[PDB]
Amino acid sequence: ASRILLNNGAKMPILGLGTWKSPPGQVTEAVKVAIDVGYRHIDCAHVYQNENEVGVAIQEKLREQVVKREELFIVSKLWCTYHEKGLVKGACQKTLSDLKLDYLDLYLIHWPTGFKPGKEFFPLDESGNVVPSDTNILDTWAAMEELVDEGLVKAIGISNFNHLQVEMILNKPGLKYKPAVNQIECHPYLTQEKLIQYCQSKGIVVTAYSPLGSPDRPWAKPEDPSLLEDPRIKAIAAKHNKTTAQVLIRFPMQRNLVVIPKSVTPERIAENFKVFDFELSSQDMTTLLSYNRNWRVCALLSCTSHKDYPFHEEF
Numbered sequence: 301a302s303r304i305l306l307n308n309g310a311k312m313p314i315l316g317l318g319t320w321k322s323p324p325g326q327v328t329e330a331v332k333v334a335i336d337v338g339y340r341h342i343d344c345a346h347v348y349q350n351e352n353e354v355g356v357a358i359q360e361k362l363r364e365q366v367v368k369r370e371e372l373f374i375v376s377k378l379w380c381t382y383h384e385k386g387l388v389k390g391a392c393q394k395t396l397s398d399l400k401l402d403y404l405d406l407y408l409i410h411w412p413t414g415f416k417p418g419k420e421f422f423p424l425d426e427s428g429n430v431v432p433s434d435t436n437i438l439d440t441w442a443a444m445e446e447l448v449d450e451g452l453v454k455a456i457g458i459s460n461f462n463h464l465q466v467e468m469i470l471n472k473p474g475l476k477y478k479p480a481v482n483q484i485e486c487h488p489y490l491t492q493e494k495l496i497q498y499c500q501s502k503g504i505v506v507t508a509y510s511p512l513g514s515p516d517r518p519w520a521k522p523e524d525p526s527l528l529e530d531p532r533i534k535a536i537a538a539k540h541n542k543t544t545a546q547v548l549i550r551f552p553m554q555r556n557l558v559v560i561p562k563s564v565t566p567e568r569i570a571e572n573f574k575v576f577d578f579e580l581s582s583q584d585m586t587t588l589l590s591y592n593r594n595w596r597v598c599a600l601l602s603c604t605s606h607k608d609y610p611f612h613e614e615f
């Protein structure tokens with residue numbers, strides 16, 4: 301099936317288009333192309349600095365009647381400097397304004413780490429440490445719940461939450477809406493079995509980010525592992541007459557995950573969508589899982605001292 305049922309009753313397309321690092325001068329056409337070739341889910345964030353341009357594409361396709369709003373699933377994320385309960389609504393409204401929408405299908409707490417509010421996405425002390433917020437994440441969650449009740453978002457969720465942090469939300473006194481989704485890094489070098497099992501057992505859908513290993517991540521080093529160039533994954537792809545990227549996208553789909561590969565290249569946007577016509581064997585799946593190295597694309601040293609930094613825990 302092309303969609304997965306969320307715990308709010310809505311269906312979420314299991315394939316979406318990522319937009320982190322998509323240049324503002326290219327992302328409008330990227331999203332237009334994606335919608336033209338069948339994508340119905342776009343993953344966005346305020347911190348990506350391109351929501352206005354993403355919105356231009358969505359709006360044109362709605363105006364052109366290529367797709368109805370109800371058929372789209374648009375996701376964005378609350379940045380760390382907006383965890384203060386009194387700032388959450390305004391942050392959501394800014395994202396809605398930029399995307400030119402009157403609701404989001406899903407709004408995520410981007411990271412469990414709250415930062416000092418202000419214009420800077422990463423406010424630093426004079427010694428280079430990120431400056432935290434004293435806001436409790438349970439209070440941030442209550443503010444997210446208000447967005448559902450005010451009609452700004454259809455679903456709320458979390459991102460980069462470790463299992464104890466997910467548990468904190470699930471155990472929140474007076475919890476009104478469970479998180480619908482936990483969006484986490486996941487690919488054959490960071491397979492996330494423990495966290496995935498935990499979330500799924502609680503009815504939380506997992507979205508896999510950086511499924512191709514984020515080769516355009518700005519902190520990449522030449523000697524880093526490369527999923528797209530792994531000869532073992534290439535061999536599995538060859539067996540199926542698919543590309544390595546297509547195998548990397550199909551892999552999380554067969555684990556009942558949502559997956560959000562990013563591209564601004566029209567040929568690749570189309571390629572990445574052509575993943576509903578083959579099946580990896582159980583053996584293929586277990587073989588891909590065996591490549592786990594606990595290797596993370598997404599982490600940040602400046603935030604490792606933050607009390608809510610998610611990656612000290614095993615999972």
Ligand SMILES: NC(=O)c1ccc[n+]([C@@H]2O[C@H](COP(=O)([O-])OP(=O)(O)OC[C@H]3O[C@@H](n4cnc5c(N)ncnc54)[C@H](OP(=O)(O)O)[C@@H]3O)[C@@H](O)[C@H]2O)c1
Pocket residue numbers: 317318319320321343344410459460483484508509510511512513514515516528543545546560561562563564565568569571572598
């Ligand atoms: N919640 C979070 O904290 C978080 C963190 C990271 C990512 N994300 C989300 O997840 C999305 C995906 O992750 P990502 O952007 O880190 O990396 P990714 O999707 O794993 O990889 C993107 C890179 O792969 C290239 N690529 C795409 N398709 C390809 C294909 N078929 N063949 C060869 N190369 C291909 C892209 O190049 P071109 O664009 O030049 O074609 C780009 O350099 C992000 O854009 C964002 O929406 C969320």
Ligand SMILES: O=C(O)COc1cc(F)ccc1C(=O)NCc1ccccc1
Pocket residue numbers: 320345347348349380411413598599600603
């Ligand atoms: O956060 C994303 O979606 C992708 O990464 C970025 C995307 C951006 F646009 C800007 C920054 C980052 C970044 O460094 N993230 C790592 C991080 C952020 C916050 C707390 C702990 C680790």
